[PDB]
Every structure is written in structure tokens, then in C-alpha cells.
Amino acid sequence: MGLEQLEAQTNFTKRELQVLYRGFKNECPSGVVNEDTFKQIYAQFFPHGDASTYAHYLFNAFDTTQTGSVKFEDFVTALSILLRGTVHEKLRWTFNLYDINKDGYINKEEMMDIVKAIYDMMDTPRQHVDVFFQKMDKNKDGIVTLDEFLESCQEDDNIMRSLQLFQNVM
Template identity: 25%
Template sequence: MDRNSGSNLNVQKIDRSPSTSSIGSHGTVDSGRSTASTNLSSVSSRRRKGVLGRIETGFRSVFRRFSRPRTSLTEMEAQLLSATTNYTREEVLQWHKQFLIDNPNGYMTRKQFISMYKSLFPRSDAERFARHIFRAFDLDNSHTIDFREFLLGLSITSTTNSIKTKLEWTFNVFDIDGNGLLTRRECLEVIDAIVRYYLSSESGTHNSNNDSIVNLAKRSMMTIFDNVSQNPADKLTRSQFVEGCLKEQFISQLLAPTSNTVLINTQSTFDNHSTDSKHVL
């Protein structure tokens, strides 16, 4: 999930050359909607864990002071986003401008988020995939994504971040009920959606090996549960999930690719594991 693939925003328009636009220290540029401090303070405890939790905690303390509508982005906010993400100040402003073109209200609803993915990948099961990804972008659990959340998610999923950071973020994709623990059922559902989405978006058709690759991914995910502290577990914490994924090369490569190519060498990985294939579920 590279930062250039997660949106219908015109990425080609985002230029790394110095921006000619400027704003004063008290000036504003267009951004998303107003959110009261009570909304920011209602972030669930699971969002405070790990790297994302530390990011959110820092932003809550700053953004709660701003009562202005989020159709305006201050210089301070732009600088904070630049410091927290992999983007320069100029890129933050350009992303923000394009975000408002596609989302004039300053935020994206779940329906809009799903529609975006469906338009990008009409031949894949994008709706099912997007429902799970939306959960990770929606840091404050408001059922919408504002510009700040959008840019943080885009940055974290970029190839410049470490595999561990990406996996900590991906935990939220798998945590369907939001209780901070992953069950086997949750992991089987989400890994199935992710693999089928990637395979169909790459080929556009159903390949005879698709089901086998999906089952391989499910087996690898269940191995993480089985190997927790040398004792099979039915639930995973964030740290256990990250540690387990790092040990499972196929899952790590799938969830946190280190290049712009998704499912790198998936077919060869499948071939290497096909001799001990089992049926999952």
C-alpha cells in the first residue's frame, strides 16, 4: 500500500519542487471539517498503543485547541503534519489542496472511501477490502476520514516506513471489533479480503491458483497464533501480531511490502509451500 495508490487524488499533480504558495504563521489554507475537542478525547484505548497511538496522542493535545472549521489548515498544523509524516511542508499543502477538490466538505465518509477504491480497481473486490482499510485510517472512530487522518495513513503505508511501523498500523485493519485484540476469525476474514483484492486487482480475472494462494495466506496467519510463546493462542495483542508477522515471511511481504509492487513473488512463494498445502476453514 504505497502512498501513491491509496486514493483517487491526482498524484501526478503532487510535485516535489518547492511550492510557490505561502501562508503566514496565523494564515490558513483550506482543509476538512470542524471537530470538537470532545470527539478527539473519545479515541479508544486501542488507538493509543504503539506508534500510531503516540502520534494520535501528540496530535490530540494540539488539535483540540483549534475550534475553527477544518476547512482551514494553519501554518502550525501544516508544520506538524510535515514533522509527523514523510512529506515536506509544500507536499502537505498540495495534498491538502487536492484532498479538498475531491472532498469539498473536508472529510471523506465510509461510502466515499469505498467508492474511491471501487473506481480505482473496478475489477476487484474493492468494497470488502476498503471497509477494512477504512477502519485503520479512521483514527478517532468518527466513521469519517479528515485530511489529517488521510495524510497520516498515507504516510505510514508508504515504502519509506519500516516494516514494523506498517505492521503496527495494519493491526487496526484486522481489529474488526476494535477491542485491541485479534481473534482467529478476524484474521481469517481480513487476510482473505486482502489477498483476493490484491490478486484480482493485479490480474482482473480469477486465476486457478487464487484460492490456493488465499489458503496459504490463511495458514500462515494461523501459524502466528499457533506459535505464540510456543503455546497456541486464540487472541493476539498488537505486539504479538507484529512479532508473528515479522517471522512469517509471506505475511510480512503481503502486509508490509518493501517496494511499490504488492504481493511480490507471490506465485513463487506459493510454489515453495504447495507441497504441504492444507485446506483452511
């Protein structure tokens, strides 16, 4: 907790960090987000759709510290990486989210869990993983690594165009 301190370790300005904290605290008033809180947030964004499973994968992406529940400090740095951070940080974060078991690699069924997790929270019947792996895997052994993911996203200029769109808050 520190407005001047976070201004250094993030890319957001003093004015943005205030808006982001207000936006954060309004969802968990000194409660510090847990899995349930995430579910309630994305349920509000997506009506008639169960967001339980995705909230679980999203919560597992956090927690580097102690209490399990992710604090604002870790909430905002993750958001700093996603909105302002370099391309090898945004993709690195996305890759970290796709790797559920947290063991360096993304597999067919692992990816299938996440595609199902988004489809459930809200034309190919969940098997859009087949299109994903065919144009992301260099080895073609059913495993996409970090280095494999980073270089494969560079080749599709359409992703880089959307990922570097620059999204201001406030």
C-alpha cells in the first residue's frame, strides 16, 4: 500500500492509480480479491453465463506472496504489464495464464480447459484448440512452450496490432 511507491514500480500515473484503486476497492472493500470475488465481477460483465471455472484459472495466475488472496499491489502490476508493459511481458502473462499446472508448457487438454472456461462464462464447438495448435506449435508434438508462443505471435501481425493497441484507463 503506497501511492508514491506504486507509481515507481508500475507504468500507471498517480492519477490512473487512484482510479484503478477506486475501481478495485468497489469490488472488494478492504476484502482483498479471492476466487469468489472474481466470479462475481465477471458474472456482472457476462449475464446468463457461469464464470466459476475461469475465475479459478484467473486466480491461480496470481499469488506470488503469502496470504493466497491477491492484494492490490499484485493486482495493479499485473494490469500494468497487460496494458502498458512490453510485448514479452503481455504474452508472458498470457502464457502464464494458459499454463494451468504452472509447469512451463501448454498442452491440448490444458488449452481446452481455458477455451471452455471462457465459452462457459458468457462457431467451432470448443475445439478451436485444433486451429490454435496447428498455427502456434513449431515442433508439432502437442506442446507449446514460452519461446514457441512468443515467436509464433510475432508472425501473426494481426495479434501484435491488437495487443499493442494502447488502452488508457480513467
